[PDB]
């Protein structure tokens, strides 16, 4: 459960990303692929090479979904229902993987927004990502 301050923190931080969305998204995936090789097993037919256009494209998609989540923070399950279907019902992604991507996203944000990545903001983002993860790993339809 996010507090009012959490939502505000997330909106402020995420808002900074801007047109870098896809870039940060791609970087987060690459950090994941390198640090946690097992995750690659969910992308059997991908070109996962460094600077791959496939990963850049996917990074964009991931980032957009997060923007979507921020814009519907108070009613997430309805906004991301399509994504739950895919990850929970179709792909059946083990929840541990969401912790891995979440961590890689936090690392990406820390490396790019030094002034925004305060302890308080770090805390809010962690919670938000956990919230998103819960929705994508649930079957509530």
């Amino acid at each position: 459960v996010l507090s009012p301050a959490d939502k505000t923190n997330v909106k402020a931080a995420w808002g900074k990303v801007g047109a870098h969305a896809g870039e940060y998204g791609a970087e987060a995936l690459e950090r994941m692929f390198l640090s946690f090789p097992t995750t690659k097993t969910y992308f059997p037919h991908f070109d996962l090479s460094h600077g791959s256009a496939q990963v850049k494209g996917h990074g964009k998609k991931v980032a957009d979904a997060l923007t979507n989540a921020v814009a519907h923070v108070d009613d997430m399950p309805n906004a991301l229902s399509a994504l739950s279907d895919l990850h929970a019902h179709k792909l059946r992604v083990d929840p541990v993987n969401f912790k891995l991507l979440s961590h890689c996203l936090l690392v990406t944000l820390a490396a790019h927004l030094p002034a925004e990545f305060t302890p308080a903001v770090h805390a809010s983002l962690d919670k938000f990502l956990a919230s998103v993860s819960t929705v994508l790993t649930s079957k509530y339809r």
Binding site: L34, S35, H103, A110, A111, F117, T118, P119, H122
Partner: protein, 144 residues
């Protein structure tokens, strides 16, 4: 933990550039802020009422250096982490009863602090090497 020669160099080189006086306190502080149930173990540390209070607490900055010192010992003996952390394992498990999942959380918070500090220098490959170290340390602490 087995790091390739390349990984070891990458890790040790970055480590020489870490402010030993401040990074430890930042990591511990962030743990207390981000996963607040962890504060329960540092009740004797004073005011952990707010992030600001946490981040500024002298006992947190002091304790932080101790923690980092432990990470350094690990780096110097990747060969025998279990042996190196035997006593610490004992303290944390036996006497403090800290759930092992919390060791993973701190290792991760340290990675975030490194990224925060080094910016672009903290590349994916550099991150990958560091993730092996923190997993190593976490496992050795949970050994008991």
């Amino acid at each position: 933990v087995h790091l390739t020669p390349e990984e070891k160099s990458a890790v040790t080189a970055l480590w020489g550039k870490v402010n030993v006086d401040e990074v430890g306190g930042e990591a511990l502080g962030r743990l207390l802020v981000v996963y607040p149930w962890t504060q329960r173990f540092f009740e004797s540390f004073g005011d952990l009422s707010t992030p600001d209070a946490v981040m500024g607490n002298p006992k947190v900055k002091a304790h932080g250096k101790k923690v980092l010192g432990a990470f350094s010992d690990g780096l110097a003996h990747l060969d025998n982490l279990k042996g190196t952390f035997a006593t610490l394992s004992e303290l944390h498990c036996d006497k403090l009863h800290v759930d092992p999942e919390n060791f993973r959380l701190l290792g991760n918070v340290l990675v975030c602090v490194l990224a925060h500090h080094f910016g672009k220098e903290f590349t994916p490959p550099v991150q990958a090497a560091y993730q092996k170290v923190v997993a190593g340390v976490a496992n050795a602490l949970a050994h008991k």
